[PDB]
């Protein structure tokens, strides 16, 4: 760990600065270092970890999609080689995040809020691996589904339907169903049920909670509009 010599608090502070500078690779390295200190992460710290790696892998996914499309049309070795290079780097980032979750964020997350957060992340990074997998692929897909479903089960027992982690989990699991599992009806049913159950609970929310929940509800609606 190249971050092993830096104080945990300094790593968190620098992750926040990297975010403001849109330096997401740095942000992810700082947050990896913070995780490797071995202590549990607070809610803010989990959000910092998630934002950093989401942005890094999101850039890799966007690039992979551009290159894959070019490769498909072309069907020399260069396009394949370069797509493979990006793919391998993306898989490396996913393996790194899954490694952090397995060593040892998930096992040490006692609270439902933390366990759901990390199981959602596990589903997300298996989903990103599944996007680029080509057969191996089945095991990755089933692994994503199992992580998402365990998170769903916990979230339903322990969180209200407006909780933003529960909502984002359902949003992402719905996308998994649509784009990975080739189960669009499951995707649509989950987004709709999630939206309707949250709508019925908005009356319980303060102004701040209402803003969080309705933001994600709009994303659910956006996806349903795309899919129907």
């Amino acid at each position: 760990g190249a971050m092993g010599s830096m104080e945990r608090a300094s790593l968190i502070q620098k992750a926040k600065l990297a975010e403001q500078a849109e330096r997401y690779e740095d942000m992810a390295a700082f947050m990896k270092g913070a995780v490797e200190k071995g202590e549990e992460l607070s809610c803010e710290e989990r959000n910092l970890l998630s934002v950093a790696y989401k942005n890094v892998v999101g850039g890799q996914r966007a690039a992979w999609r551009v290159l894959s499309s070019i490769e498909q049309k072309s069907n020399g070795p260069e396009v394949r080689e370069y797509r493979e290079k990006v793919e391998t780097e993306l898989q490396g980032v996913c393996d790194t995040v899954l490694g952090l979750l397995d060593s040892h964020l998930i096992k040490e997350a006692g609270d439902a809020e933390s366990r759901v957060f990390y199981l959602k992340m596990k589903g997300d990074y298996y989903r990103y691996l599944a996007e680029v997998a080509t057969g191996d692929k089945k095991r990755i897909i089933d692994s994503a589904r199992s992580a998402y479903q365990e998170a769903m089960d916990i979230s339903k027992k322990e969180m209200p339907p407006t909780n933003p982690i529960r909502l984002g989990l359902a949003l992402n699991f719905s996308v998994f169903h649509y784009e990975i599992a080739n189960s669009p009806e499951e995707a649509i049913s989950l987004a709709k049920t999630t939206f309707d159950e949250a709508m019925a609970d908005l009356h319980t929310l303060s102004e701040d909670s209402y803003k969080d929940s309705t933001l994600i509800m709009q994303l659910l609606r956006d996806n349903l509009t795309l899919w129907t």
Partner: peptide
């Protein structure tokens, strides 16, 4: 592509 968070 669809929204995820």
């Amino acid at each position: 592509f669809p929204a995820t968070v």
